[PDB]
Amino acid sequence: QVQLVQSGSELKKPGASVKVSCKTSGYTFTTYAMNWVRQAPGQGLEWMGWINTNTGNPTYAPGFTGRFVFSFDTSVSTAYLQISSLKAEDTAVYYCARVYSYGVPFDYWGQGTLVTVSSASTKGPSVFPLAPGGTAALGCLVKDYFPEPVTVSWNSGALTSGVHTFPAVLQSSGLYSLSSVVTVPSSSLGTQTYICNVNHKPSNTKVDKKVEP
Amino acid sequence: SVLTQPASVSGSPGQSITISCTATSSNVGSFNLVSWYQHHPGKAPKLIIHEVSKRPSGASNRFSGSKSGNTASLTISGLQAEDEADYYCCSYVGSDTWVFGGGTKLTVLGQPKAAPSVTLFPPSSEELQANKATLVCLISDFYPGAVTVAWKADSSPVKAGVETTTPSKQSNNKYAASSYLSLTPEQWKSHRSYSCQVTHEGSTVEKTVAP
């Protein structure tokens, strides 16, 4: 049946370029227009425009003229979106959607393509210990790393119960920080050793940080 | 935006909710080409109403749509948990162009309210050796998922050096958030104490830490 399958996530620096693809199947590609919709962080859906798959004429809404290009390759039933001179404010999930008629717009959607535009570079985290009724709380601060993701564990995975690893922050500088805390009996602090095991695959860095009172 | 929607709407399971959509200009014309969409996180939007009221197959018959003047309205009867999502209205605005509304966050109040548990850590010893200072305010187990965080040095407020997350759904379906205040080691030791204030549903939980 009808299917719109987009390309995978993209990471780019400002000024760079990106080209997102939208492969179609289940219907004649040239019979229906292809539309593009953008969702920036903490914002709504914003219509970008469409391209007539018969004439090729593109229509760009105000706000997406000058740096955006819609295109298609009928040989493989694919539509394309290219962005030139990427700006940080381009960071958004880009969708392709089909229009069946004026009365039925956007009846089939691609799954979306995350395009991130950041000036920051790969960087390993700086792990700091967060020293500790009856129960005491201690954790680790995973600080100033890029890009997502970090994984945390405790005592090589032997302290699952009572653990909460918090989603990361995006600093204004562009680097991410997070923390994970564990709630443990206070009677334990005497020689029971707690270690957070931090893994940041992108930077090929693992840190085991001893958290002592 | 060309189409105004309520920023958020809340209903309890079983009730029927209504979401409005007002045309801000005459570019919509007849206003008979209105469509609604259900947008869950991590997934693509889904068409649920087109041409003001037409419900397509594959969308449940609990969703309906009406119009009055220049206000399109989306009603969801027998509210369910999986209905919690973003909802957008859309309209043709002439010359082969479409526009979306700002979207509405529909919350299904399907859980008793819960005040946040707050935990504030002072700067670690190591970090002070590195000539940085970070306060960690960990907020957990609060429902609904909406908080505002304010920091204070002694009693004066602080907004510089503050980074706060959006609430996130925990394992137990309650929400979590975190906030970080960045200082210089001098600033940290300059004041008698710093505080993190979590306001949730008009009530404040405040933790204080001092050097």
């Binding site: 040239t30 019979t31 229906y32 229009v99 004026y102 009365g103 | 008979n32």
Partner: peptide
Amino acid sequence: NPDPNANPNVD
């Protein structure tokens, strides 16, 4: 105010 059955993907 176009026709809802009309296809905008005209030649």
